[PDB]
Amino acid sequence: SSDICPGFLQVLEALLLGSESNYEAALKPFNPASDLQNAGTQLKRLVDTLPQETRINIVKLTEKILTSPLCEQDLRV
Amino acid sequence: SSDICPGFLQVLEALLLGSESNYEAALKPFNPASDLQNAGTQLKRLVDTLPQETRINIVKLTEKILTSPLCEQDLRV
């Protein structure tokens, strides 16, 4: 379900896994305040310090929340 | 809009800001594989190393994506 706003899954799919460009780029479509933008970069580094497998699990971790009867809720249908 | 699955905003609201308990707890309703669970903790630490204000911005950062005409999309209505 498109609750996983494509734009949102985009950056995560790359904070966690793709180059600094991959982030900065992932981000332009939002146009965050530089201060904010900057906070983002600060984050991207520590994330970069963890192993491919640690970081991969962080991706699987999100996918565990994102696809359980908790998240993909039933409003009306 | 309830696209921000409450459960999902829950943990983030606390990876980024609340105690180790706050995370571990935020997480139980999902029941992740221990290995996965563990990956999560690894994350929570580096996040804990950044300043309150850095981390706060990471919260504002998400809220910037999450509430733009990009994310809160128009399917049908």
Residue A4, domain extent: 1-77
- A9: tokens are 């899954």
Write the single-letter amino acid at B62: T
How far from B23 is each of A12, A53, B14, B27, B69, CA to CA, in Å?
Answer: 19, 21, 6, 6, 30
How far from A67 is each of A55, B12, B23, CA to CA, in Å?
Answer: 19, 16, 19
3-state secondary structure of A8: helix
In angstroms, the separation between the Cα of residue A18 and the nearest Cα of chain B is 17
The CATH number linked to A31 is 1.10.210.10
**Which of B38, B49, B71 lies nearest to residue A5, judging by beta carbons?**
B71
- B10: tokens are 């829950």
- The string over A12-25, giving b where at least 16 C-beta atoms fall within 10 Å of a residue's C-beta and e elsewhere, is bebbbbeeeebbee
A57/B contact by beta carbon, under 8 A? yes
First to last CA, chain A: 12
- Identify how the structure was determined: X-ray
B72/A contact by beta carbon, under 8 A? yes
In angstroms, the separation between the Cα of residue A70 and the nearest Cα of chain B is 7
- Give how many domains chain A has, as a whole number: 1
Subunit contact B5:A47, Cβ cutoff 8 A? no
Total beta-carbon pairs less than 8 A apart between chain A and chain B: 94
Backbone conformation region of residue A5, classed left if phi is above 0, alpha if psi is from -120 to 50, else beta:
beta
Name which of B2, B5, B16, B48 to mutate to probe chain A: the one with the most chain A Cβ atoms within 10 A of its Cβ: B5
